[PDB]
């Protein structure tokens, strides 16, 4: 649904995120395995789950992240994070 | 040009006719956009989507676009002939004035 | 990789040695050379066209080959001595000018070389107007040879054995001279660089000729530089060529009469283009003009054609910079227009580099 | 009517015609206009359409003969309007009734928003005025009377703060601007006065006049821009176009066209474009609004035009005009006379230029509608 008026100016990252969004909020609101499968073929590919994915999993939990960190090899975040 | 104001309609067309003369876009769409933001806090529907689509914008016309749907949501306001008057691009950027338009002619066959 | 590896200065000793460090390894290169230049681009089996596209890529690739062969000879012969032309064209520099050009070379029947290649090239046909068979079947294998024949031609060492051989085999300069007019050519941009190269070299003969004092060379000169008629192809030298009216000009005594038509330097004239062809970078017109200037402004830098003129996809990824960094928050239904705009210009710079290429060979010429 | 330009017989009265900018300003082609019915039974603002040659906005279709899309009713009359807004459209009456309606862009209609009754008041109510001609501006509505009567109304609020009704002489038929607290009346003889924001009594401040040709003034407008360009029009020609607001006598005379002009409109979108139409049937068009320094469409008619590049000299010895101080001769530019129509009908009263269609009301109750095709 395009709430905010699309333009060739911004790149399609907010597009997929709002569409990710939207598929989340039609499947499901609690169950998260699909952004552990989404964050876990993130960084299976090399590059962090994004700030806003950072953002709603840090509101929502926290000892997740961290494990999921320290399997990932991401010490330095694990480390902040739990600080 | 963008720092001196742009609200009394003296001033604004002065400005307007100014980069007209210029031959400029982007002064243009940001006096478009700023009589369309007083037209809409002064309340006018019309001007500000002569505005926005003067100005080749989106943004109030998806505003006038919900403000129609909440209207004809509350009492059902879909007498506009203005569609059928005159045309241009309003129909492509929106979907509320397409949905009239469409409506009225098949209202009409 | 030989020509882009041959780009610097002082290098061309070691290859020069290794080409004759034993004369066996120089007897096996000859030998190679001869089967190599024996047959690499033959008419109708190899030069066809209803046939499969193997034998066009074959050819494609051997006059690529022998492109590369002409530029590598060329950048070694812009340097200074030694040079690695004379060593790929079997004649040096050192010998005398009695044994420099041999006497063999133009016989049918002696051990093919860069002469005997070139007599193959050029004999077969009809040495007069519109040319021989070579411009019927490749006009680039023309431009080739007039660009090696004024390679050798603006050296002071070279110049004289080179024609000299070439008036003594069988008059090879009057038939290379008699080819002007071009009349079978596929392009006007192709005829008028044919015609002006073929200028260039008869001017630099000329131009050799009055230095080393050759009355009969000069008058047979100047006579196919000022016949009206067509003439006949004659062989009566009193000196060294045609002296007389009725060897050279004979074409007025045939017609019965003379003016001003069917010249050669006429036809040339009317053949070349009359209209002036102006380069124009970048137009737009479909936006505000203040824009429009900006942007061609802001659009001006060197390139490899030669103007202020930029690539083809480069300016169009400018374009589409320019545009999308000069917007607001709707831009929908834009992009066919945009595209369209793209390829609209494109096409522009494509006919103003053609246009371009045909000014080149105007002033060129 | 059915070929060439569009030719209809309504058959009343064309007092004021404007077009809307409803259809201007936009994507949309100018084609929606409005018209009052002086002088007749009822005194309605009738919203009509025109039809142009072509579609590039949905036009209408035939070959012309505008059709009235709405109309609007009130018990007052119709004197003139100006379009201070798309939607706000302000009318006065000569018997003291100010409307103000209301017109809906997305409903095409008209609605009765203010009949102020009891219009021109400022220390009481139940008061009576006739008015000639009102203009707006921002923020300030100014309605001029016969007797000098000068009525101001604000466009934040829907009320009357000032009234000055004084004894002047002869008869004021229009009025300008120059500024908020300066306003410039023209006479029926050739007079010129200047008035202030804050003028109390009788007696005139500041009486002008020109010196030369002195015939009576009859239209007269003000610049959508700067306010102090004014646009003149009467019996022989006596308009004093001036780029500025300041000098006690005007030095400028434009002397042209012995017909009388009985209106003379501007091009709302590219204020540049100058038409005025004649008495004997000729609709003539100038261009360059005197500030505007660009060629000039052909010359005509007694006036300094204006200037633009030069090159190209030779080495000798060459000019540059002077210097001169005179009430005769023209100081600025602005006649250009273009034939058009030299003679074709009998009687035109108004016309009204938008875009590229011309809109022309006769005395003999009809209506002419022309696309330009000049630049």
Same mark, same amino acid.
């Given at each position: 649904?395009?709430?905010?008026?699309?333009?060739?100016?911004?790149?399609?990252?907010?597009?997929?995120?709002?569409?990710?969004?939207?598929?989340?909020?039609?499947?499901?609101?609690?169950?998260?395995?699909?952004?552990?499968?989404?964050?876990?073929?993130?960084?299976?590919?090399?590059?962090?789950?994004?700030?806003?994915?950072?953002?709603?999993?840090?509101?929502?939990?926290?000892?997740?992240?961290?494990?999921?960190?320290?399997?990932?090899?991401?010490?330095?975040?694990?480390?902040?994070?739990?600080? | 040009?963008?720092?001196?104001?742009? &609200?009394?309609?003296?001033?604004?067309?002065?400005?307007?006719?100014?980069?007209?003369?210029?031959?400029?876009?982007?002064?243009?769409?940001?006096?478009?956009?700023?009589?369309?933001?007083?037209?809409?806090?002064?309340?006018?529907?019309?001007?500000?989507?002569?505005? &926005?689509?003067?100005?080749?914008?989106?943004?109030?016309?998806?505003?006038?676009?919900?403000?129609?749907?909440?209207?004809?949501?509350?009492?059902?306001?879909?007498?506009?002939?203005?569609?059928?008057?005159?045309?241009? &691009?309003?129909?492509?950027?929106?979907?509320?004035?397409?949905?009239?338009?469409?409506?009225?002619?098949?209202?009409?066959? | 990789?030989?020509?882009?590896?041959?780009?610097?200065?002082?290098?061309?000793?070691?290859?020069?040695?290794?080409?004759?460090?034993?004369?066996?390894?120089?007897?096996?290169?000859?030998?190679?050379?001869?089967?190599?230049?024996?047959?690499?681009?033959?008419?109708?089996?190899?030069?066809?066209?209803?046939?499969?596209?193997?034998?066009?890529?074959?050819?494609?690739?051997?006059?690529?080959?022998?492109?590369?062969?002409?530029?590598?000879?060329?950048?070694?012969?812009?340097?200074?001595?030694?040079?690695?032309?004379?060593?790929?064209?079997?004649?040096?520099?050192?010998?005398?000018?009695?044994?420099?050009?041999?006497?063999?070379?133009?016989?049918?029947?002696?051990?093919?070389?860069?002469?005997?290649?070139?007599?193959?090239?050029?004999?077969?046909?009809?040495?007069?107007?519109?040319?021989?068979?070579?411009?019927?079947?490749?006009?680039?294998?023309?431009?080739?040879?007039?660009?090696?024949?004024?390679?050798?031609? /603006?050296?002071?060492?070279?110049?004289?054995?080179?024609?000299?051989?070439?008036?003594?085999?069988?008059?090879?300069?009057?038939?290379?001279?008699?080819?002007?007019?071009?009349?079978?050519?596929?392009?006007?941009?192709?005829?008028?660089?044919?015609?002006?190269?073929?200028?260039?070299? /008869?001017?630099?003969?000329?131009?050799?000729?009055?230095?080393?004092?050759?009355?009969?060379?000069?008058?047979?000169?100047?006579?196919?530089?000022?016949?009206?008629?067509?003439?006949?192809?004659?062989?009566?030298?009193?000196?060294?060529?045609?002296?007389?009216?009725?060897?050279?000009?004979?074409?007025?005594?045939?017609?019965?009469?003379?003016?001003?038509?069917?010249?050669?330097?006429?036809?040339?004239?009317?053949?070349?283009?009359?209209?002036?062809?102006?380069?124009?970078?970048?137009?737009?017109?479909?936006?505000?003009?203040?824009?429009?200037?900006?942007?061609?402004?802001?659009?001006?830098?060197?390139?490899?054609?030669?103007?202020?003129?930029?690539?083809?996809?480069?300016?169009?990824?400018?374009?589409?910079?320019?545009?999308?960094?000069?917007?607001?928050?709707?831009?929908?239904?834009?992009?066919?227009?945009?595209?369209?705009?793209?390829?609209?210009?494109?096409?522009?710079?494509?006919?103003?580099?053609?246009?371009?290429?045909?000014?080149? /060979?105007?002033?060129?010429? | 009517?059915?070929?060439?330009?569009?030719?209809?017989?309504?058959?009343?009265?064309?007092?004021?015609?404007?077009?809307?900018?409803?259809?201007?300003?936009?994507?949309?082609?100018?084609?929606?206009?409005?018209?009052?019915? @002086?002088?007749?039974?009822?005194?309605?603002?009738?919203?009509?359409?025109?039809?142009?040659?072509?579609?590039?906005?949905?036009?209408?279709?035939?070959?012309?003969?505008?059709?009235?899309?709405?109309?609007?009713?009130?018990?007052?009359?119709?004197?003139?309007?100006?379009?201070?807004?798309?939607?706000?459209?302000?009318?006065?009456?000569?018997?003291?009734?100010?409307?103000?309606?209301?017109?809906?862009?997305?409903?095409?209609?008209?609605?009765?928003?203010?009949? @102020?009754?009891?219009?021109?008041?400022?220390?009481?109510?139940?008061?009576?005025?006739?008015?000639?001609?009102?203009?707006?501006?921002?923020?300030?509505?100014?309605?001029?009377?016969?007797?000098?009567?000068?009525?101001?109304?604000?466009?934040?609020?829907?009320?009357?703060?000032?009234?000055?009704?004084?004894?002047?002489?002869?008869?004021?038929?229009?009025?300008?601007?120059?500024?908020?607290?300066?306003?410039?009346?023209?006479?029926?003889?050739?007079?010129?006065?200047?008035?202030?924001?804050?003028?109390?009594?009788?007696?005139?401040?500041?009486?002008?006049?020109?010196?030369?040709?002195?015939?009576?003034?009859?239209?007269?407008?003000?610049?959508?821009?700067?306010?102090?360009?004014?646009?003149?029009?009467?019996?022989?020609?006596?308009?004093?176009?001036?780029?500025?607001?300041?000098?006690?006598?005007?030095?400028?005379?434009?002397?042209?066209?012995?017909?009388?002009? @009985?209106?003379?409109?501007?091009?709302?979108?590219?204020?540049?474009?100058?038409?005025?139409?004649?008495?004997?049937?000729?609709?003539?068009? @100038?261009?360059?609004?005197?500030?505007?320094?660009?060629?000039?469409?052909?010359?005509?008619?007694?006036?300094?035009?204006?200037?633009?590049?030069?090159?190209?000299?030779?080495?000798?010895?060459?000019?540059?005009?002077?210097?001169?101080?005179?009430?005769?001769?023209?100081?600025?530019?602005?006649?250009?006379?273009?034939?058009?129509?030299?003679?074709?009908?009998?009687?035109?009263?108004?016309?009204?230029?938008?875009?590229?269609?011309?809109?022309?009301?006769?005395?003999?109750?009809?209506?002419?509608?022309?696309?330009?095709?000049?630049?």
């Amino acid at each position: 649904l395009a709430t905010v008026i699309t333009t060739k100016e911004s790149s399609a990252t907010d597009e997929a995120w709002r569409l990710m969004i939207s598929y989340l909020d039609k499947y499901e609101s609690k169950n998260t395995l699909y952004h552990h499968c989404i964050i876990n073929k993130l960084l299976s590919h090399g590059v962090p789950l994004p700030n806003w994915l950072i953002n709603r999993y840090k509101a929502m939990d926290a000892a997740e992240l961290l494990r999921l960190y320290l399997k990932y090899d991401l010490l330095e975040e694990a480390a902040e994070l739990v600080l | 040009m963008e720092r001196i104001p742009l &609200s009394t309609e003296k001033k604004a067309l002065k400005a307007l006719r100014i980069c007209e003369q210029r031959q400029m876009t982007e002064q243009v769409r940001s006096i478009c956009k700023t009589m369309a933001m007083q037209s809409l806090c002064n309340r006018r529907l019309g001007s500000a989507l002569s505005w &926005s689509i003067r100005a080749k914008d989106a943004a109030f016309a998806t505003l006038i676009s919900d403000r129609f749907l909440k209207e004809y949501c509350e009492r059902g306001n879909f007498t506009d002939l203005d569609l059928i008057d005159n045309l241009g &691009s309003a129909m492509l950027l929106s979907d509320r004035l397409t949905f009239l338009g469409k409506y009225r002619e098949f209202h009409r066959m | 990789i030989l020509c882009s590896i041959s780009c610097n200065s002082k290098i061309q000793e070691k290859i020069v040695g290794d080409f004759t460090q034993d004369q066996n390894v120089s007897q096996k290169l000859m030998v190679g050379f001869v089967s190599c230049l024996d047959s690499e681009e033959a008419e109708e089996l190899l030069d066809s066209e209803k046939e499969a596209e193997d034998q066009v890529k074959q050819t494609n690739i051997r006059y690529m080959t022998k492109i590369h062969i002409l530029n590598l000879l060329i950048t070694s012969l812009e340097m200074k001595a030694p040079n690695l032309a004379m060593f790929l064209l079997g004649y040096e520099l050192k010998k005398p000018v009695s044994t420099t050009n041999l006497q063999d070379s133009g016989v049918l029947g002696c051990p093919r070389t860069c002469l005997h290649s070139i007599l193959d090239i050029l004999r077969k046909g009809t040495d007069v107007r519109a040319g021989p068979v070579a411009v019927w079947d490749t006009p680039h294998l023309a431009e080739l040879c007039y660009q090696v024949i004024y390679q050798l031609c /603006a050296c002071a060492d070279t110049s004289g054995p080179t024609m000299r051989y070439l008036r003594t085999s069988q008059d090879f300069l009057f038939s290379q001279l008699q080819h002007l007019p071009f009349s079978v050519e596929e392009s006007e941009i192709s005829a008028m660089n044919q015609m002006s190269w073929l200028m260039k070299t /008869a001017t630099i003969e000329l131009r050799i000729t009055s230095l080393n004092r050759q009355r009969s060379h000069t008058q047979r000169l100047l006579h196919l530089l000022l016949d009206d008629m067509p003439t006949r192809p004659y062989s009566a030298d009193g000196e060294g060529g045609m002296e007389d009216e009725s060897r050279s000009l004979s074409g007025f005594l045939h017609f019965d009469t003379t003016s001003k038509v069917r010249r050669k330097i006429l036809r040339i004239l009317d053949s070349i283009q009359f209209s002036n062809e102006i380069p124009e970078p970048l137009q737009l017109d479909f936006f505000d003009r203040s824009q429009i200037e900006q942007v061609i402004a802001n659009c001006e830098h060197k390139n490899r054609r030669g103007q202020t003129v930029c690539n083809v996809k480069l300016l169009h990824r400018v374009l589409v910079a320019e545009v999308n960094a000069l917007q607001g928050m709707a831009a929908i239904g834009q992009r066919p227009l945009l595209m369209e705009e793209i390829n609209t210009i494109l096409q522009y710079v494509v006919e103003r580099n053609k246009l371009l290429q045909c000014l080149h /060979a105007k002033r060129h010429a | 009517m059915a070929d060439k330009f569009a030719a209809k017989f309504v058959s009343h009265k064309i007092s004021r015609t404007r077009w809307r900018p409803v259809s201007a300003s936009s994507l949309q082609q100018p084609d929606v206009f409005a018209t009052g019915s @002086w002088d007749n039974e009822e005194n309605k603002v009738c919203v009509w359409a025109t039809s142009d040659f072509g579609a590039t906005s949905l036009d209408e279709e035939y070959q012309g003969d505008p059709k009235q899309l709405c109309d609007i009713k009130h018990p007052g009359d119709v004197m003139d309007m100006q379009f201070l807004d798309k939607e706000r459209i302000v009318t006065g009456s000569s018997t003291g009734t100010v409307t103000i309606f209301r017109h809906h862009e997305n409903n095409q209609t008209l609605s009765v928003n203010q009949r @102020w009754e009891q219009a021109h008041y400022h220390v009481g109510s139940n008061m009576r005025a006739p008015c000639t001609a009102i203009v707006c501006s921002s923020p300030e509505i100014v309605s001029v009377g016969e007797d000098g009567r000068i009525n101001c109304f604000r466009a934040e609020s829907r009320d009357v703060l000032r009234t000055i009704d004084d004894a002047d002489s002869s008869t004021m038929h229009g009025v300008t601007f120059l500024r908020t607290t300066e306003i410039l009346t023209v006479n029926s003889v050739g007079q010129l006065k200047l008035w202030d924001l804050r003028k109390q009594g009788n007696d005139p401040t500041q009486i002008f006049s020109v010196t030369g040709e002195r015939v009576p003034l009859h239209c007269v407008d003000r610049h959508p821009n700067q306010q102090h360009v004014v646009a003149t029009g009467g019996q022989d020609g006596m308009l004093c176009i001036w780029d500025v607001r300041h000098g006690k006598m005007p030095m400028s005379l434009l002397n042209a066209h012995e017909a009388e002009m @009985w209106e003379v409109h501007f091009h709302p979108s590219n204020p540049d474009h100058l038409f005025t139409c004649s008495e004997d049937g000729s609709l003539w068009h @100038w261009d360059a609004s005197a500030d505007s320094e660009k060629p000039t469409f052909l010359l005509g008619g007694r006036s300094t035009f204006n200037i633009s590049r030069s090159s190209i000299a030779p080495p000798n010895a060459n000019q540059s005009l002077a210097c001169a101080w005179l009430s005769t001769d023209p100081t600025k530019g602005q006649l250009e006379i273009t034939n058009l129509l030299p003679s074709s009908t009998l009687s035109v009263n108004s016309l009204d230029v938008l875009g590229q269609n011309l809109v022309c009301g006769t005395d003999a109750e009809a209506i002419y509608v022309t696309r330009r095709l000049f630049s």
